[PDB]
Amino acid sequence: TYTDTQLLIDGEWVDAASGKTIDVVNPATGKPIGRVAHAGIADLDRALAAAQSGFEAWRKVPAHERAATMRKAAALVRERADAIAQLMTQEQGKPLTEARVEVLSAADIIEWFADEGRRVYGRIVPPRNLGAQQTVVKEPVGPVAAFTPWNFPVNQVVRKLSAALATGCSFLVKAPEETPASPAALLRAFVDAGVPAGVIGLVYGDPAEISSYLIPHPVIRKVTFTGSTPVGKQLASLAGLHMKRATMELGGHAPVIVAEDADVALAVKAAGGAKFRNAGQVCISPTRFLVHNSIRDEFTRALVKHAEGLKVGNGLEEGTTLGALANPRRLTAMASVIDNARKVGASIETGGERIGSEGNFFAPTVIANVPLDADVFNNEPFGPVAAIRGFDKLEEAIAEANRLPFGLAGYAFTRSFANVHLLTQRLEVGMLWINQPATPWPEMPFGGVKDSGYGSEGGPEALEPYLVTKSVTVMA
Amino acid sequence: TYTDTQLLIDGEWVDAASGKTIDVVNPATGKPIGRVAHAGIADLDRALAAAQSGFEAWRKVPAHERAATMRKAAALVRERADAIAQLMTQEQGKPLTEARVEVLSAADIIEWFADEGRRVYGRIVPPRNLGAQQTVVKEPVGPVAAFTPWNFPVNQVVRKLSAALATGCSFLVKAPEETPASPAALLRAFVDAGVPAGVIGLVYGDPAEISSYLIPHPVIRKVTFTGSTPVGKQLASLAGLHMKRATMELGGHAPVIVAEDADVALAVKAAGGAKFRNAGQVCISPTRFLVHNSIRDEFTRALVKHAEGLKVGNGLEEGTTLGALANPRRLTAMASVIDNARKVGASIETGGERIGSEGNFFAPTVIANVPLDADVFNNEPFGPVAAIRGFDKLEEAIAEANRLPFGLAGYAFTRSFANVHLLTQRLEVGMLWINQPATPWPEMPFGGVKDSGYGSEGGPEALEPYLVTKSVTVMA
Amino acid sequence: TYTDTQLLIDGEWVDAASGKTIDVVNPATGKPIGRVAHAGIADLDRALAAAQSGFEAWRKVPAHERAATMRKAAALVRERADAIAQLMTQEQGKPLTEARVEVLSAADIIEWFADEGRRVYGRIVPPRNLGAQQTVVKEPVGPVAAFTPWNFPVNQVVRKLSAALATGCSFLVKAPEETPASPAALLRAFVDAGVPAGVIGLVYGDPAEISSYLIPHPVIRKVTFTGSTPVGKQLASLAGLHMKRATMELGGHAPVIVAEDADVALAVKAAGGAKFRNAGQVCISPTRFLVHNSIRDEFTRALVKHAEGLKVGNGLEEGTTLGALANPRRLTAMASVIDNARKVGASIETGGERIGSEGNFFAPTVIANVPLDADVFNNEPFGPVAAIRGFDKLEEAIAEANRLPFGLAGYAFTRSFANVHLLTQRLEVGMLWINQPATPWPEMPFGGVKDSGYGSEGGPEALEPYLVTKSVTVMA
Amino acid sequence: TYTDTQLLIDGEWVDAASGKTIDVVNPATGKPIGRVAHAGIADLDRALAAAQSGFEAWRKVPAHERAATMRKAAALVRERADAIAQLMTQEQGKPLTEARVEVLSAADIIEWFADEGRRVYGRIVPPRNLGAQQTVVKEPVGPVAAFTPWNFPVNQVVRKLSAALATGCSFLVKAPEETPASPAALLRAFVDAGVPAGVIGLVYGDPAEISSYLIPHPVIRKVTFTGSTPVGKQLASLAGLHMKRATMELGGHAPVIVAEDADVALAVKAAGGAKFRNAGQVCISPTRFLVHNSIRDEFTRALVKHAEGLKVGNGLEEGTTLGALANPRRLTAMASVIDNARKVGASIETGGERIGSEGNFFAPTVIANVPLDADVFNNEPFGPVAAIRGFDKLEEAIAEANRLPFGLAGYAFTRSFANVHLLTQRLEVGMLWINQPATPWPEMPFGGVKDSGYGSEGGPEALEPYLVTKSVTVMA
Numbered sequence A, B, C, D: 001t002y003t004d005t006q007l008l009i010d011g012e013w014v015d016a017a018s019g020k021t022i023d024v025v026n027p028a029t030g031k032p033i034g035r036v037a038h039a040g041i042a043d044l045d046r047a048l049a050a051a052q053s054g055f056e057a058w059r060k061v062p063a064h065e066r067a068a069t070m071r072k073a074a075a076l077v078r079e080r081a082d083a084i085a086q087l088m089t090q091e092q093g094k095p096l097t098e099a100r101v102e103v104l105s106a107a108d109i110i111e112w113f114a115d116e117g118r119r120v121y122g123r124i125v126p127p128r129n130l131g132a133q134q135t136v137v138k139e140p141v142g143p144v145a146a147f148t149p150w151n152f153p154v155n156q157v158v159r160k161l162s163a164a165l166a167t168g169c170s171f172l173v174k175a176p177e178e179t180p181a182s183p184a185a186l187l188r189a190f191v192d193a194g195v196p197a198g199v200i201g202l203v204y205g206d207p208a209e210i211s212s213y214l215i216p217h218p219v220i221r222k223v224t225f226t227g228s229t230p231v232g233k234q235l236a237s238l239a240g241l242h243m244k245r246a247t248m249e250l251g252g253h254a255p256v257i258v259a260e261d262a263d264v265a266l267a268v269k270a271a272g273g274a275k276f277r278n279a280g281q282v283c284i285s286p287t288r289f290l291v292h293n294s295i296r297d298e299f300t301r302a303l304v305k306h307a308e309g310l311k312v313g314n315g316l317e318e319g320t321t322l323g324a325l326a327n328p329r330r331l332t333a334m335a336s337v338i339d340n341a342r343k344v345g346a347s348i349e350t351g352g353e354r355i356g357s358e359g360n361f362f363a364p365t366v367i368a369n370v371p372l373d374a375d376v377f378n379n380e381p382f383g384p385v386a387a388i389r390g391f392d393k394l395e396e397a398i399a400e401a402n403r404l405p406f407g408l409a410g411y412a413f414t415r416s417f418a419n420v421h422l423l424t425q426r427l428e429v430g431m432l433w434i435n436q437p438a439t440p441w442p443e444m445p446f447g448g449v450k451d452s453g454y455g456s457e458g459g460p461e462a463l464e465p466y467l468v469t470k471s472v473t474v475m476a
């Protein structure tokens, strides 16, 4: 079973006024599975009016009641994990097992943020005149416009949504048209748990028309976007033209520094498993594997065997560990990346081709002998491709790791305290994981530097983009 | 005695490569008093190269050394405050007494920030696996491009500068061409204190050309602007287009709520004093006086008396209490404001005219019976004009206070806990002062919401726009 | 139904090795209702060995798993609220309605602390040498010995227990022999939710023998006591002799300052309702009512009518709003207080006598015209007695409020911001509530100054007594 | 040149009312060099009355003024450091170079704490009812009684003093009778800087009589002791009996773990240097050297060489690197320690004897082959003796490090992240230094666990024992 998806406006699942829809396809087969409403300006207007009202209601609900309502929604998400996972796999491609992991980690996210909303603390400042009380109070910024991508349909919504609700803002999101049902189910849990009419809204349609209307509108006080660097720059540019608060999680290009002293088997297992997660369609996916020359050959061979062990297929079939890529553009993007690697003299150690003629299946691929000018070492591939290059000195791996304008995630494998410390200071990334894969828990900051954007989506720092800070000084 | 001004590039005071200069005029006379170097692109390229290596040097100086160096700069600023104040008064117009208070408080600000840099703390998070250490590390974002205006030539540079230096960033500021000598004496204190070559740079010239070149440049990792709403929109847009971190301190339109239970004498002395500070040329200048009908007329007469007691004249005369406006565009703007007020049926209770035919002298002015559609009640006057309206109910005054897209400062006068609490929760401002004038100590956040911008320039919060936050997890 | 109570040692409900028990009485009738095991030194030894083991296990369980186990126990407490309330009312005396409130607020407490255990943050300090990492880590102190009283049998356990478990300490408590079943049910929820063997223990017996053995024993690293000031001083003295960490919540003697501008009806309702809560057997119960002379007579008369409206009786019978006092000593203590008031010239405005000849029923009592040397104005009465005295100047009410060595809770009623501010600065109390009764939520600090003891039992400060702080500096 | 010492009471240097004095002797010669006033009860009563009104004055001085005054004191301490150091060396014995470093670092400590007092922040908590403001306010606890020992006559006073003054407390210290002039010059700097009359007081006499009188006295709200474990037990017991807040910094017995992968030359230079600092008369002096068997013998020989290179002599000679021990009871104690070591079969590798027959000179000593039952491996030697033992496995060394009831400082030498992480989580100490000697900067917490005491004397945590925390909730 796969369901058609509607807009959520003012507590009501509704069609667009025009009645227009967009078709949704299963990327494992290319076959239509359902449809989603395509919003016009008139539905956005109704959504903006409701977000204004929702904001006025939700800001007045004490943090401990907001928190309990969020926790109920999380319990519902958790109760419905199987059904939501099933929707997600059909629209997006990832294996059922990975979809369930994402839905459960959404529940965990909502819960931590629920509790953090109760710890949005002001402060009292020792005063220069004891007749006066000097305070700093924190309040919600106002209605949020959010724009989220298809690669983790639920999780890319839930951090933003959980942050907005915990601070007491209202929230209007344009979820992905290619993966609409799983996020709509996430929103439905919040409605079912008691979040009032107007506090949350959900639209789909033409992304550029929606973001062009929403971002400049006087109801919206904060914009949040997760996506590509080039669309991020257009949106941050418009947000600045209209003096809106904005945060952005954009491309990454994660380096992986496997040092001379690394546990090599651990590196292959950790960084290899993390590469093929969601078929590499992850903003923090390990991409540029910088491997000390003493162990490069051993690493490369073991990474190749890891890729060869993956079972490619429809994400509903058990045994599947690597599903369809999410859409046909991702297939074309992979061929372009592979063609360019071969042209510039790199070696395809395994994979490198489409599998079959139906759906978006690409083989897990490992590329070695990669020169610095290959597309795979410069543009974010966002697909099931690891690129390996050797180095002799740790300092040259670190310079390579910082060479690109991306800087989101970084990985390393090493045993010495001095190398940890050096990597910690020197690597230009938002997030660094050593001797393990990415474990991006809600309590941990999650955000970029440079072209990867700005603003955190974890920790207490995740509430700051949704808050205004007010200095209040009262003389008795 | 007034001094020509040069660029500060790589530890040296230098002319522009071209030899071009711009004339500086005394706004009390219209007469040339000196000139400032006019940078072109070649000078900016040298400033940027120096800023890069400066960032690389300064980020390695431990915090406690950076603090001690900053405190040395502060002590020199304190000692030279009267000679710096004489420069400021000549180029900008404010009375000497105000200029001294500005410069002495610059020293106070440097000291607080020097100490704050020793408290940029990371976090250790209780881990999900006890075999890993999860930390949150803070580090300087990089070279900063700062753009500052003429109203507080020193003070608008000093918080930005101190924040940059306390975090380990390097700093390149374009200070105002019409008030260049006093900001250059501020940077000189720092050079004399031992801030190394390239860590600070100062340039002057064509604002648009410089900002268009600096903001997109790869060296600049962060932008900070203080000035008008419409210019900040243009710059935050450019900054968005090149994915640069940006803070913005923009227009205000500060309401004053004088409640039924207010002490009227206090309200006039506090808010009337604050209105005519630097001739209203202040982003936090009280502008819209909303006075409870029971005391509207009594307040209006007392504010009229306050304004008629100011002594208008050259700021170098020590008894001068209202100097010349900073520049001729400010006279033009006061004429338009008063003209519209008269045309919409408001009453000019005092002032309303230029004084003399030389310099930029405008009389301190009070406007009563002001309709909500008057320019003075919608656009930021930025000059020595107060606008008075009545109200019956506190909640009508709060709604008027929140009508405008501006939201920087607010003031109120009241004695009940209930009113204090209400004004605290409901007024859409970044800073609220109750029963006293503005006291923006460095330890207190200072920043806007809505069209007034974003980012704070006081408190620990002042450092965050200059920091990047990095999640580090290391499995042992 | 009322059940006999056993010791909890190493995951097992067990009898004492001697087989000794103590009888439990219903204070509403004087009739035996059950019994509780009476521990000897040999059972304590087995308890201390298990706490050592429990500490070694529980310290290794990640904060997010500890947190989920605590939340389950809270859900169980909440599921069993009726059954636990019933036990409590029979052993302790309070009305069923109030017992249910306490059990539910216990669940709320456990939950907030569960979440706070995940936010025991270390920090990273900017280093004096960048080659070195300077960190501050937080770890559990070790096994706790706790000693809790009969007045809120569950709540006096739950803050201490929740704090210890959230930090990762083990916990051994000696609960009250006169009210053992309700706390034992609280502990049983934690066993049922999965807290491992040894992490929690529960003993009863002779309090002085237990605290004399536990406090000096090398397994115990932290002592916590809630009780009387004189027993607190003996226990803190012994804890210091053995260099143990100790916190103490001791007597209060709460002032209530009803100022000239008070809402009088609000004062009677808030402070009057709070006085007769748990029949005044509360460490923060409003006791010394300092009332401005203009409204003293009106206040006194309305407080008298509030007391006269209470329905005294068995706590299981519906309609009951004031139950039996908890034990016969409390009845004797009340007569002594009333006899002394009459002897020193005060007036008994209502109540003042035992009701009936069975059980521990005392009438709700209001005393006026109280001189400063009455026992009720010096010793903590801990019973259903309010004592009223007038004042003319707010400064003399404040001096009276600070006259005694107690300082736990304080109350006031006033409308002006200046009075709030003055009271906030000047009143020597741990907790001050204005214009409302006590709402001691888990997120709020709860602790004394002076003879009322030290250490907080709310907020993040509640974890600090259960934590050690370790500076770690590692040179690369 | 050495100066007799007086009491500091109410802004005046005075004799005891009685005229009694105590002789002060130079420990390098046994010869009188001056005398110190010997307070009786009447002097203490005047000190306490002054401390009370001092507390009332100082708590009203805004933080920023208190800071500026403290910084002035710091500057005077810096300027006078060499004259203060000459006093210290004569009365206490340490080399002049060490005495200068102690006094210069006292100035650094005052400065950090002065700034920290401006950051004693309260909290605003998100309320359960939006009509109330819930705040957490911090305020000084009250007059402090401080008791300090002879080992760092200045430095043991300065953190306590600075913490007291930064929070708004008044401070009355009993400094050591055997080293009285240098602490009195520290208090003089503060008097000269403008700390008002009564805010500080200094007394000398009979330690027991003074502590027995001060600790129970109603004026004293807080006690702080640094000294021996057995004396601190006696004082923390007395403090408990009168319900006074207490902090305690007591004995240490610092392990040094030299791991298999350690740099031996670094370990000897860092830990060997630290052992013979102030002749081992330091609560954090490395004592139990636990060295991996592969390098035990090499470490032992190198430490022997380090010790034989010290230059023993009068501390006034600038080339002296090990001075006389502070007092004759310290010789007696070194003789007992060495004697027991010999009797239990340990080997004296170097030193082991008194040098000369005048003064308190004891040779730098290294003991190897030390059994676990030797006095030197159980009791704090507090003198110039290192005790060496081997180990095979890191976890046996950790268990030995944790065997003793002491837990102040620890040291280790190792290069692997795994070992660093393990030592961090498992070593029962308050401070751990890895690959370097002790660097206890004021910004870092400094305090023990178990028998070494409680309370921190660095970091923000240093202020908490001098603060009370007050929950304030005000319903509007």
Ligand SMILES: NC(=O)c1ccc[n+]([C@@H]2O[C@H](COP(=O)([O-])OP(=O)(O)OC[C@H]3O[C@@H](n4cnc5c(N)ncnc54)[C@H](O)[C@@H]3O)[C@@H](O)[C@H]2O)c1
Pocket (backbone or CB within 6 Å): A147, A148, A149, A150, A151, A176, A207, A208, A209, A211, A212, A226, A227, A228, A229, A231, A249, A250, A251, A252, A282, A283, A329, A380, A381, A382
């Ligand atoms: N950071 C991330 O997690 C993330 C997510 C999705 C895609 N991407 C990057 O971009 C590529 C995405 O490919 P794509 O084919 O989806 O192309 P795209 O660049 O057109 O899409 C980027 C995202 O922005 C949205 N979008 C596009 N134009 C928009 C507008 N004008 N207003 C609002 N939203 C708009 C899309 O719905 C999509 O989710 C990937 O290869 C990857 O490198 C990154």
Ligand SMILES: NC(=O)c1ccc[n+]([C@@H]2O[C@H](COP(=O)([O-])OP(=O)(O)OC[C@H]3O[C@@H](n4cnc5c(N)ncnc54)[C@H](O)[C@@H]3O)[C@@H](O)[C@H]2O)c1
Pocket (backbone or CB within 6 Å): B147, B148, B149, B150, B151, B176, B207, B208, B209, B211, B212, B226, B227, B228, B229, B231, B235, B249, B250, B251, B282, B283, B329, B330, B333, B380, B381, B382
């Ligand atoms: N504290 C403040 O926030 C502040 C300060 C000065 C002016 N203003 C506002 O601006 C109004 C008009 O000011 P004005 O007469 O200086 O005119 P303006 O708006 O042309 O200039 C405003 C400021 O921005 C700068 N600026 C202008 N264009 C720029 C560009 N392209 N790049 C970089 N910097 C640029 C100027 O150097 C000046 O300091 C004032 O009346 C007031 O409302 C606000």
Ligand SMILES: NC(=O)c1ccc[n+]([C@@H]2O[C@H](COP(=O)([O-])OP(=O)(O)OC[C@H]3O[C@@H](n4cnc5c(N)ncnc54)[C@H](O)[C@@H]3O)[C@@H](O)[C@H]2O)c1
Pocket (backbone or CB within 6 Å): D147, D148, D149, D150, D151, D176, D207, D208, D209, D211, D212, D226, D227, D228, D229, D231, D235, D249, D250, D251, D282, D283, D329, D330, D333, D380, D381, D382
């Ligand atoms: N930094 C420290 O923590 C520190 C400092 C000095 C001594 N000690 C320990 O104490 C041992 C012996 O020291 P000692 O020879 O000075 O003998 P001691 O134990 O008699 O004195 C220790 C300190 O406590 C003080 N003191 C003693 N009785 C007191 C009382 N009743 N009230 C108040 N203060 C009192 C002394 O003035 C002295 O400063 C040392 O060898 C060492 O183990 C520790």
